[PDB]
Amino acid sequence: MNIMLTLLTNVTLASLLVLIAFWLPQLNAYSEKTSPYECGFLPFSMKFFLVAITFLLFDLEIALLLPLPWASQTNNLKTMLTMALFLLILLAASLAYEWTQKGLEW
């Protein structure tokens, strides 16, 4: 209930400030800027998406690497160490593949 209370209070405070910043300040009359948004009419470059998919996959591998602190308490330390090093080596291998091949163009 405490954490829920913190979330509620923070959200309500932020929303109240947004109210007093979006609707309260616009009450003051400032004439009227009869100025139309003159619009008269697409850079979908892979340069952006590539940065996104690669991040998704590396974030996935990072997710597998999260339980490591508790995994150090296992009696089978050798096996756990080997598996952790394996996951890290695979992360490095994925990075190397992209770097060696046509990747990391960002």
Partner 1 sequence: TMYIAFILSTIFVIGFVGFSSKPSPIYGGLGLIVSGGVGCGIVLNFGGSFLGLMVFLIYLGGMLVVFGYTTAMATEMYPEVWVSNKTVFGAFVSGLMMEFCMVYYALKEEEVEIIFKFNGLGDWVIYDTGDSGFFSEEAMGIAALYSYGTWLVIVTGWSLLIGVVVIMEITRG
Partner 2 sequence: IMKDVPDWKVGESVFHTTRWVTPMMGELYGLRTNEEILSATYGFIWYT
Partner 3 sequence: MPLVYMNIIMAFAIALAGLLMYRSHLMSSLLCLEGMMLSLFIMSTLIILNTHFTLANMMPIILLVFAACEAALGLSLLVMVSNTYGTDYVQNLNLLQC
- Give yes or no for residue 68 binding partner 3 (CB under 8 A): no
Nearest residue (CB) to partner 1, 17 versus 104: 104
Q: Rounded distance, CA 19 to CA 13, Å?
A: 10
Considering only 8, 9, 11, 49, the residue that binds partner 3 (CB under 8 A) is 49
From the list 68, 47, 59, the residue with the least C-alpha distance to 94 is 59
Binding-site partner at residue 2 among partner 1, partner 2, partner 3, none, CB < 5 to 8 Å by type: partner 2
- Give yes or no for residue 55 binding partner 1 (CB under 8 A): yes
- Give yes or no for residue 1 binding partner 2 (CB under 8 A): yes
Place of tokens 């974030």: 59
- Give yes or no for residue 4 binding partner 3 (CB under 8 A): no
- Give yes or no for residue 73 binding partner 2 (CB under 8 A): no
> Cα angle vertex 62, ends 104, 78, to 5°?
120
Q: Rounded distance, CA 7 to CA 103, Å?
A: 41
What DSSP assignment string belongs to 22-80? HTSTTSS-----------------HHHHHHHHHHHHHHHHHHHHTTHHHHTT-S-HHHH
Residues that bind partner 2 (CB under 8 A): 1-4
Residues that bind partner 1 (CB under 8 A): 1, 42-46, 48-50, 52-57, 59-61, 63-64, 66-71, 73-76, 79-80, 82-84, 86-87, 90, 93-94, 97-98, 101-103
